[PDB]
Structures are given as structure tokens and as C-alpha cells.
Symmetry: none
Subunit: 304 residues, 6 copies
């Protein structure tokens, strides 16, 4: 009896087995669960906005879109595990059904599957950009969680660097992966970085004053400004550390934020940055590129 | 002074900052904490033993050892936080001091730093092997977590394929990385897979009999044999489900496993596998290599 | 002194004492607590509906009703302890007030008091039926607990067999206890078994739609259908394993069940079973019995339309 | 699809299935686990000792022994669940492996299996005795649990009545089941009641001084004496209420009980009871029976001197 | 090295050091925490109301008010830690931030500081009243804790005597301290005792029906009445023993108390006591005192109608 | 019905009831338990030593002894509650049987009963000294607890004055309450203070040469000296913050204490103090008091 078992073990050692579809369906549970929920789909619009300038074939666009979607969904899974959230897109979080271990494993597995997808493009530069983007994203996530846990308020420059590490990396990688097969070889990166900063700043106001950040202890842009500009009071720190859900705490925080006139400061920053972005877009058009209605639509569609 | 700020932000957008040491130091906290504690360090012996046949320079050996050490330590962090452990190498786990999210981020960051290090060898084959090994490791870890959480006892074959995915991948990657700059191009992979299987089985035996697997609900070789030898008895599986810390339950589990004669089965299994490994070694030496005392020493060191 | 105490003990050994009323009132605490809360009382209507066909005297009817009520309440106590519930009939459970040991003891004591009450009828058949019914009830409860604890989804046939063991036994015992003193000696067992299955399926459906089963991790008819209809998807099985008390998880589970079309399956099942039950009722009446409005009313009260 | 399922359900309603061995093995897990552990088995010797006087065939003896063993093991399971114990016979309790619900269901199922086994003897007297014994056992267990939970110290007479209900019922049932087929129709009940009282008192003494009762907050014979002899001191009762696992508290409790001189009281009590039991035995032998060495050996084994 | 240190030690022995403020502020942490939070301040109204009949100077009034405030706050700290409370005056308890030993020490230190402040009035009678009042308070607190821990329901008379010791002592001491310098030398003590009893009963009523007493297992007036009127029912006692935090158990307890009709009993009790207090007030005014609006106001404020 | 109960309540208000013995036996229960265990009764010998000079009647001596015994036992109860101890005089602590609330109430009740006993002496001075001594004791206990729980190491002088507040107060009170009826009227107080400090230092020394202070976190004289010198190596501090009972965690502390040679420090300290105390006894002997060898016997009996 033991001889047959040992022989089978040795034979499998000589000839490794083949991966099956059922096991892959087991390992990709949380990923599919979070992918089934409909979303905003901003990155697809961002990608098709830049294709009027580049004009690459279709299959390359499909591959890039697939890679970006995979990476974004995996990042969402891991980030929700880290921040201890409770809802996402109006539905329960993935680890409220499957657990922490399964969700973490699924996210990492999706990362490496996405890396496997890039190798079929046959370009070392693609591997280089992929690795650098992933390193930047992990740096940004680590700094965000470190600041949240240690209760040390960052300055504006540190927060902007963290945001450029955490959010703009995917946009920059998506734009750089398209330029491989294009005949246009200008430099689009500053525009993409500015757009990422604008997007992140806009989604920190429209989350409070059309408040889960207070409940989760987030350090957002208006919160940082309010903390820094008036160090004479220590009520916002205590409110953030309490992690309360009652409406009284949220109302108090909203009243204190309104008192210090932070919202107008955010509005002015966004309006100056938007003007600079429009100037950047205009400057690129005289280098030999046609007008871009879609990029202006994307820029104007969000504003404070 | 909005225009003093906006200018700084736009300047950083056009010219990105540089990563600092005081930030990499805090992103690598748990990694260095776990690396400080010394361990068995078996992989270094495994690498040095195989170097007799390959005979490669020293810088390559140092690079490969560093990569393997980083991968193993990151895997240890992630596995410890997934399995809900309390001690590691006789000291408290790293995630009881720094937290969960910090350990997660440190592990992933170490993965991608190791990927960056491999890129310096200037070889696409290295990237291919690295990606395949990481995919295999994540597959194995996911299968372990699934079986443990949902309470199904795997068969012997499924457990062996799982163990090959989780454990033998690192050994195979380490051996394949050295062969790039080596002049002998035989096939060592079956031997490495068999050695990995032997290592895992011996570890599973030594953990119980010289009991955290009983407390954590792990499925091991003796536990699988004891459960499947008497399918009409449901005592061991219930003990695994309760997840108890009491010593009486552990003593009862050990007595029950001794009743079904599982440890003898494990010993005979390992003996046959060791005989096959020695025959495999002797087969290679007839193709034009020299006698290797180190591999025989490491093989005979762990006999049950 | 020691002599007086020893003499009293020896005398009590020779002549045992008599049971009192205070101690019985102490031992019957949880039973009276659960009995004081008003309920639906479907079994009384079930007994009164079949009495039209049998036409037995009144005293036998009172005795049988009392026995059935005792057994039902004791089973409810034990079941509520085993399933780890929090509310019954809108009120706290008995073991949230009296503890677990007292409730266990009271339930078993009521079982054996009910067995004592049957003995006064002077019929061995009553003892046989009582023993068989209690054995079946314990078998069903044990299988339910085993499946819930070990996390195995039963097949539809296994679930139906467990339901027949756990729920229909009381109905069968109630109907057979009446036939001892009746001049009608036909066979009513298939009808009562079908009625019990219909009762349980309707209760399972009405628990969720119109969600403590999701919180307790129970395996019901729609949950089994939803789990087995898409074996490659493992969301409902994980939701059951987590034992959540949040509303969003319950809403997600209900939406997922609606995606697989389980409630329609349950409705069609119940419709076909009701048709068969009406056919069975009509063939009995052709054998010499009268028309029964009450059985039709109790059958038509539970229509998932 | 739906038609086949409905037809199968209806057919199983008409023809019920058969119980399998695979499910009886599942339901009888804890019972077999506790049965595998060896024990003293005093009841077998108790049955053998009385058979010298009665001289009944062997098959009846085997049946009675089986029934008594089943009842004893089920009562042990339920008592261990209710007592919050940790070890039995040097091994973990059953509900530390299987849970509480499965153990309770197994105990009740074994009760009803034992009741089924009695029915094959074809005697109404057996059923009567069985029901009375089970009622007495449940009364005793309930009274013990109530006193322990509510922190009321019973008097000596109340404790002795509870002990007679809890322990002596099995001995009485065992002796009376043998007398159905015997030609000796004397009265043995006072002797068996006295023997049960002696058994329980000796066990209570040997548990502490050859201390889980102190950890479980029990009210035993020496504890009752120590509490009642000095009503102005409230140290032992507080120690019982704290439910401590430390050795210092147990040593303090033993020292305090030695200060009260309770163990001597227990020894003198047991000595007088043993003398009365021997007198009772000798009274029976002048009515026509022979000398019984076995009962004298059983009596003399339990001397606290 | 060791010839200087010794010199400093002997120097301190010959001339002791002087107590400093930076340590006194450390020893008075929890006291200032609890004193900063605003309160009802009923005792100030009680003192001001009785001053109309006495007409003493202002400095004495300030001293007496300070003493009473310190005593009340220290008692609040000690009870709060004894009763395992979680909230006080809508804010977290002091011992959840500063620890337990610190609050213990602060309470005792405030007791003895208050004793030191009474020595300034230069009167032995003040010391006598202070010692008697503190002894009475400790007796009452001890009896309350004993009854709560041992699970014994006091009778109405025992509860009333404990309340008189626990609550009325402070009022009696406050009135007797003011009368030292007053020129009116009648007996006001029975009225003060009646007022204290009324205040405690009203607080017990308002705590439940305007429920932490249920969570902590306290025995109050309605709870005692409900337990004692139906001694054969053991639901409220068990609810108290479980020490639950759920809302369902509290709702059930309130419904049970309403079934017994305890709140009407409390209301009638308070009404009759109020009438007697008003008659007592009117009796004193016929001996040569003026009309007192304030005492009538504070008496009519404690009406449960 | 209601009328009878209301009449009884009003009658009780008119004529208050009388205290009973069955209630005193319930509130003075956690105390009579501790009073039964035999002890060293050092204070009785200390009182009897000083009576060879004062020559007072017997009744006053009995009263003073009773008062001191009550105060000491109540202080022991409260101290054991505060410091979270497990044993006292080889027996379980009182609050391991009766709970915390009952023991605290018993201690305070005994304090006030002892105060009631002093009033029978008919002397305002007695009340004054009683109140001052109780205040000093509470100050000392509070300062110790604060230092122990806040983990701030004190210096030598503040520790010494805390000890004078905590321990010497009872000795000073006992001696002062004896001089009321004595014709001899000099100043014995500095001798009493020095004797108290010597007693405390000797007991603290013998505690580690006869062990639970390390487990609890007591700041001994050798521990204070060890932390003062070597203002480096935070191991005795941390050892005193792990509250561990393992032999190992204590096997080290004794070695670390012996490394700095604190034994010689304590021995020299106590020898100098003993010489000073002997000299102080000699000087007082010249004012006309008879030779007294009881005090010298009680000083030499506990001497290093």
C-alpha cells in the first residue's frame, strides 16, 4: 500500500501536474465578487481621451485596459482590508464575506497575473515601468497607513507626495504603456501627474460637503489644512482618534471645518490648478497635435 | 499665500522628488525586526551544497542568497499574520508590535524590491522564473487557507501538490538562478522537488512529536492519515474545529494519532523517499560530476 | 446528636417521603414562562379538523391536546437552546433568564411527565407510538445539528427526510392517539406527512421573505437550492459561516438568493404539493366519509401566492 | 426537473425510508467516546451480588446490565454538561470535543433507546418502573442545579432526599427488573436505598480527602456540615461563590473544614449506617436465604476508617 | 558619597519636610475631575431652605457647604467604583482614567481633609457628630454591598433602615452642624429623616420608569415589592443574577414589574409620606417660627403623580 | 396594607432603631479573618520597650495597643487591595474570598471605630494627633501608588520622606498617645523616626534574602540605587514592567543588582544609621532616665 503512494509521489515529482479551472475559480473569489459590482469607470475614459493624440491599434488598448482594471481592483481589495472599512459601492466589503487571508491572497495573485500579462507584449521597458509603478504604489500605501496609525499630521508637501505615489502611478503607467506602439513621442507625464492631484483633491471634498473619513480617521486635505492653520485647539485630533459614528461628532466636525474657512481654500487651490492644467493642454497642441474635446470634457466635468 | 504653494506643487509635478532613507527605514520595520532574530538558515546550506557541481563566482552567489532570504522572510511575515500565530523563533510576532497593515505592506514591498534586484542580472529568463515561482507560491498559500477555513480534509495527492507549490518553488528558483552563469546544463529539478517534499514532511512530523497545528487547525500529513484511516470516527476533526489551547486536548489528540499508527507511516514514507533521493544523486554523478559530501550530509541530517 | 440524624435517615430509607408542590413549581419554571406567551396554536386546529372524520368523545380530545402541547413546548425549549437564538414570540428566550441547565432539566422532566400522562389510557399501543415518535424527533434534531456544525450542505432528499423525522412525528402521534377510540380505521398517515412537509417549507419561506436563519447559519430549502444551483460560487456558504448580525449582509444574501430564482422554485414546489394533498383528501371522502371544510381551510391558509 | 423532485417527495411520503447504520454511528459519537474509557463499574458487581439470592437466567442479566450501563453513561454526559466540568476519568469531557448540543442529543437518544430495549421483555411493570425512575432522576438533578445556582445551603434532610432521588433510583430499577423472573418475592428496597446513600456519602468524602467540588461550587455533606455548624462565619460560602482554580484557596478550605471537624462527623455517620446495613442483611437471611459473601465484600470495601 | 546622604537623612529626621502643592494637586486628581462636572446640587437647596428658621452668619454656611460637598463627592467616587459603573453624570467614570487605587486614596484623603476642616470651628460636639455620621454611612454601604453580593432580598424594614443609614446621615449632620451657632434649639431630626427616605424612594423610582439598576443587580423599592408579592415566581431574581446588558431583558423586567403593580405602590407610599412631612412642617411653625416657602417647594418637587 | 407600612416607617423615623451584633459580625468579617493569622507583633514589643521610661498604668497601655492593632490591620487590608497581592502570611489575601468592596468597607469602618475608641480618653490632643497621623499615612500611600503606576523612578530623599509618611506615622502616634499620662516629657520623636526608617530598610533588604517585589514592581532601596547609578541599560526598569513570575525573569534581576554591589551600600547605610541611633539613645540617658536594655535588645535583634 505504501509502495503505490510513494511511487505516485515520485512520479508527480518527475512530471509536475497541470493547473485546473476549479482551483483558479476558488482562488479568484473575492476578485470576481468585487468586479461584478458596477463602478464609475473613470480610467477607461482617461485612456480613450489620450488615444486621439496617440492613435494606436485596438488589441493593445484592450490589453492595457485589462491590466489597469486588474491592478485597480486588487488595490481596492488590499486598501479596504487595511483601512478597516465596512461598505464599498453600496455593498458589503469583500472580507466581510470571505475573510482577510483569502482577500489578501487574491489581491497578490492578481498582481502577479497582471505581471504575467505584460510579458506577452515583448518589451523590457514594459517590465521596467510595471515594477517602478508597483514600488511607488506600495510606498504611498505604506506612508498613508503609517501616518494614520501614528497620529502624526503631515504637511501639505508630504501629503501631495504621498498622493502622487498612491494615485497617479496607475495613470502614468497606463499612459506610458500606450506610447510603446505609437509614433508620437512627446512628454505627457506632468499633465497626468497634475490630473491625478486634481482628481484626488476633488474626491476629498465631495466626500464631506456635496462622512466616513472621520469615522475611519482619515487625514484628508481640508482636515490637514484645519489642523495646521490653527494649532490653538486640539479637538480635531480627538475627534479623529475617537472613531465615533454618532451624528453629533460629524456635525461638530463639519461646523469646525466651516468655521476655519477651509473649503474656500480648497476651491481656490483647485481653480488655480485647473487653470494651469488647461494652460498645459493648450501648450501641447501647438507641437503638432489636434484639438482634444474629450480631455476638456473630463477636466470640466469635475470642479468645485 | 496660495500662489506660493501652487507653484511648489506644480514644480514637484514637473520635477518629481527623490526617495529618502528616513522613509525607507520606516517602511522596512517588521522586515528588519524578523531578520534580526537568527534562524536555522537551511537555504544557505542548500545553495552551497549545490554549488560544488555548478562552480559559479561569488557575487552571483551573494545576490541569489540575498534574494532568497528576502523572499523567505516576507513569506514568513505574511504566513504568520494569516495563520493567527503568537510566537516566531521564540519571540513575539512582528504584527503584535507594528500592526497588521504595516506587516502586509512590508511583505509586499520586500517582494517588489527583490524583483528589482533580479533585474540587475540582465536576463529575461530570470524574470520569467521569478514570476512563475511567485505565482506558484501564492497558489499554494491560497489552497491552504481555503481548506483550513472551509473544513475539508484534502487527500494525500492534493496535499502533496499543494506542498510542492508552496515549498519547492523557492528551492527550484534558487537552483535555476545559479545555473544561468554555470557551465553544466543537466536537469536537477526532480531532485529539488523531492528534497522539498521531504523537508516539509519532516517539519510536519517534528512539530507534533519531537502542538501549534492542533491549536491553529492545520491539516498535516499525520492528521490527514489519521482522519482518512477511520472515516467513521469524528474526534480529531472536531478537535481541530474547536481550536483549543488546553494541554489535555493536545495530549488526547497525540494519543489518538498514536492509536491509528500514523507516525510509523510517516517514518516509512520518509525512509523510502530518502532512498529514492540517494539513488537520484548517484545517477547524476555517473554523467560526469564529482562526489558531493555536503548534499549527503544535508539529506542524512533529517531522518526520522 | 449523630444518633437522631442517623435514625431519621434510616427511617426515611424505610418510608420514603412525598413529593411537594413547591419543588414542582420550582422545577417547572421555564416551562410556565414559555407557556404563558400566546402563540399561533396550529396543532389545536389540526386536531379539531380531523375530529370531524373520527368523532371521538371530548375527554380523549382534551388529554391528547394536553400531551401534544407539553411535547411541543419542551421541544421548543431544547431547540432554542441548541440553535443559540435570542428571541421567541417577541420575548427573550428562557435560557437568557433561567440559564441552560434549568431549561434542559425542565424540558426532559416535561417529556417524562407527558409519558406518565399517556399511561392512564390503558393501551400498549400508546406507549409504542410515543417511543417511536420521540426516537424520530431526536434523530431529526441530531442530524440538523450535525449538518449545521460540520458545514455540509445536505441534498434535498436528505433535508426532506430530516424534516419528516423532526416535524411530522408530532402530527402523526396526535392523529394516531385519537384513532384508538374511533370506529374509523382507515390510513391517514400519508396525508399528515405531506401536510407536515408543507408546513415546514412554508415556515422556511416566510422566515426570510414575506432573517435569523442567516445569522444562525441554518440550511433551509431556498438556501440549499441557491447553494446547489451554482456549485462554483461560494458566497452564500461563507456568509452562513460568518454568522453576521449586520443588515447589509442579510440584504446581500437575499439579493443573491433572488438572483438564482429560489423563491419561485419554492412556490412551484408548494403548489404541486398542495394539489396532491387536495387529491388525497378527495379520495378519502369517496370511501365513506363526509366533506371537511376545516381541512381545506387549514390547507388553503398557507399559499405562497 | 421540478416534477421529478415533487414525485420523489410524494413517494417518500407514501413509503418512508429505512434508518441506516451510517447515521446511527454519527448520532452515537459522544456516547461511544465516553464508553471507551475504562471505569470502576460498581453497578455490575452490585447486580452480581444480588443474583446469588435471586438466581435468574443469564440473558435477563445481560439485558438488565446493558440497560443500566446505557442509562448511567447518558446521565454522566448530561451531568458533566450541567456541572461545567473539565475532566472525566482523566480524559477531556465529551462536550470539549463535540460541543454541547450533540452531547445533549446523544444522551436523550440513548435514554429513549434504553426505553425501547425494555419493551422487548413484554411486561407493563417494567415500563412503570422505568418511567418512575427517570422522573426521580430528573427531580434530583433539577434540585441540585437549583440549589447550586441560587446559592442556598440545603439542610441534611433535603440533601439526603435529593441524593436518594438522584443516585438510588438506578439501583432500585436494576434490582426490581431482576425480580420479574425470580421466585423470591421479598422486599429489598430499604437495603438498596441505604446502600445508595452510603455510596454517595463515601464519594463526597473521597473527592476532597483521600478538590473539584470547591472549584465547581458544590454543596456536599462535609461542606453542608461546616457551613451549618458556624452560621456566623461566611468564609466557606464565599470561597464556593468565587469558583477559584488556585491551590491556596483549596488548601484554606480544607484547613477550615478540618477546624470544624466535619470529616470525623462523616466517618461516624457512615459507620452507623454500615452497622444498620449489616443488621438489615442479617434480617433477610433468617427468612430463607443463604449467606452472601459478595454483598459483604461490597459493603466492607467502602469504609472511611 | 555615603557620609552626606546619611547627614541629609538624619537632618530630615530631626526637622521634617513641609508638604508641597505639586504633590497635593496629584493626590486630588479624581476629586477635581468629579467636582468639575456640574450637578443637581440638591444639598445646597436643602441647606438654604433650613437657614430661614435658623439665620446664622455666612462664613459658617460656606464652611458647612464645603464639608458636605467634599463628603458627597468622595462617597460618589467610592460607590461608583464599588458598583462597577460605567457612566456618571453623562461622562466616563473617574476610575476608568486614573485607575482604582488612585480613586480609593483620593476618597479617603478627602474624608480626612474634611475632618480636619471641622476642627477649625473649635467644638467637640462637631467631632462627635462627624464620627457618628461617618460610621452610619459605612454601615449602610456595607449592608448594601453584602445583600447585593450574597443574593438575599431584604425586607421593606431592612431596606428602609439601610437607606436611613446610607442617605439620611449626611442631611442630619449638615443640619446639626448649622444649629451649633443658631439660637433656635428645637428638634428637626425626624423631618430630615423623612425627607431623606422620600428622596431615596423617588430616585429609585425615577431610575427605571421616568435601567442601570437591573444591569448592576441592585435591590430597590419596586424590585423588592415585585419579588416579595409573588414568592413562587423566580423570574426577576434570575434576571438580576444574570446581570444582562441587552434592552430586551430590561423591557421584560419593566413589563413584569408593571404586571405586579409596584409603581402604583411606590406612588401611594410617597404620597402618604409627603402628607406626613407637610403635617410635620406645619406642627413646627406653631411653636414660633415663620413660614418657609423653600421647604414646601423642594417637597413638592419630589412628587411622582 | 399600605397604612401599616407607612406607620411603621414614620415610627422608625421618630425613634431610630438600635444596631445589632449579627450585623457587626457581617461588616467586621473581612477583618476578623486577617486578625486570626499569627504575626510578628513587633509593635507590641516596641510599645513595651518605651514603657520602661514612661511608667504609665495598664489600662492606657491596653487601649493604645488595641488602637494600633486595629489601624495596622486595616492598613494591611487596603494596602493588599491596592498593590494587587496574592498571599499574606502564607495564606490567601482577604479580597480573594470576600471581594474588593467588602474589604474596602471593612477597612474604612475599622478606621472610624478606632477613632471612636480614642474619644473615650477625654483629650483633644489625642484627636489632633490621630487626624494628623491618618492624613500622613494617606499621603504616603497615595504617593507610592502614583510612583508605582506612573513608572517614574524617584530619588532617595523623596522615597525616604514617603517612607516616613507611610510607616513611621503609626510609631509616632503610638509614642505620642502614651505620653499623655506620663510624667516624663522630653522629645523622643527623632529616635522613633530613625527607628522606623531602619526597620523599613532592614525589612526591604531581608525581603530579597528570605521576592514578590520584582513581580509586582516595588521600588526597593537597592532597585532605586541601581537605577540611579548606571543611568543606562533600561532592563531593571523594563523587568519591573513585565510583572512576570518565571524564575528566569528574576534569576537575572538578582545578578544585575549584585553587579553594582548594592549590598555593601545597604549594609553601610544601615550600619551608620544604627550607630547614630545608639548614640541618640545614649544622649537621652543622661537626662535622668534609668538604664533600659529592652530597646537595645530590640535594636540588636534586627541588625545586620
Amino acid at each position: 500500500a505504501i509502495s503505490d503512494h510513494t511511487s505516485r509521489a515520485i512520479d508527480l515529482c518527475r512530471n509536475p501536474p497541470l493547473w485546473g479551472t476549479d482551483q483558479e475559480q476558488t482562488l479568484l473569489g473575492p476578485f470576481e465578487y468585487l468586479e461584478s459590482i458596477p463602478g464609475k469607470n473613470i480610467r477607461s475614459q482617461f485612456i480613450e481621451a489620450f488615444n486621439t493624440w496617440l492613435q494606436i491599434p485596438q488589441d493593445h488598448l484592450q490589453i492595457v485596459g485589462k491590466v489597469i482594471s486588474m491592478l485597480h481592483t486588487a488595490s481596492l481589495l488590499v486598501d479596504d482590508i487595511e483601512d478597516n472599512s465596512l461598505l464599498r459601492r453600496g455593498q458589503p466589503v469583500a472580507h466581510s464575506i470571505f475573510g482577510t487571508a483569502q482577500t489578501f491572497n487574491s489581491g497578490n495573485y492578481v498582481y502577479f497575473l497582471a505581471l504575467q500579462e505584460v510579458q506577452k507584449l515583448n518589451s523590457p521597458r514594459a517590465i521596467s515601468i510595471f515594477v517602478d509603478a508597483l514600488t511607488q504604489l506600495h510606498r504611498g500605501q505604506g506612508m498613508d497607513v503609517f501616518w494614520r496609525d501614528s497620529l502624526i499630521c503631515p504637511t501639505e508637501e508630504e501629503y501631495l507626495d504621498m498622493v502622487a505615489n498612491k494615485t497617479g502611478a496607475l495613470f502614468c503607467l497606463a499612459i506610458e504603456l500606450l506610447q510603446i506602439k505609437s509614433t508620437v513621442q512627446l512628454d505627457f507625464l506632468p499633465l497626468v501627474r497634475l490630473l491625478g492631484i486634481i482628481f484626488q483633491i476633488c474626491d476629498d471634498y465631495l466626500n464631506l460637503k456635496s462622512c466616513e473619513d472621520i469615522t475611519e480617521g482619515k487625514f484628508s486635505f481640508p482636515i490637514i489644512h484645519s489642523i495646521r492653520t490653527k494649532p490653538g485647539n486640539r479637538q480635531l485630533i480627538n475627534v479623529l482618534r475617537q472613531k465615533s459614528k454618532e451624528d453629533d461628532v460629524k456635525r461638530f466636525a463639519l461646523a469646525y471645518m466651516e468655521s476655519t474657512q477651509s473649503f474656500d481654500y480648497t476651491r481656490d487651490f483647485v481653480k488655480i490648478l485647473n487653470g494651469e492644467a488647461l494652460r498645459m493642454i493648450e501648450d501641447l497642441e501647438q507641437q503638432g497635435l489636434h484639438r482634444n474635446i474629450e480631455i476638456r470634457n473630463i477636466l470640466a466635468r469635475m470642479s468645485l
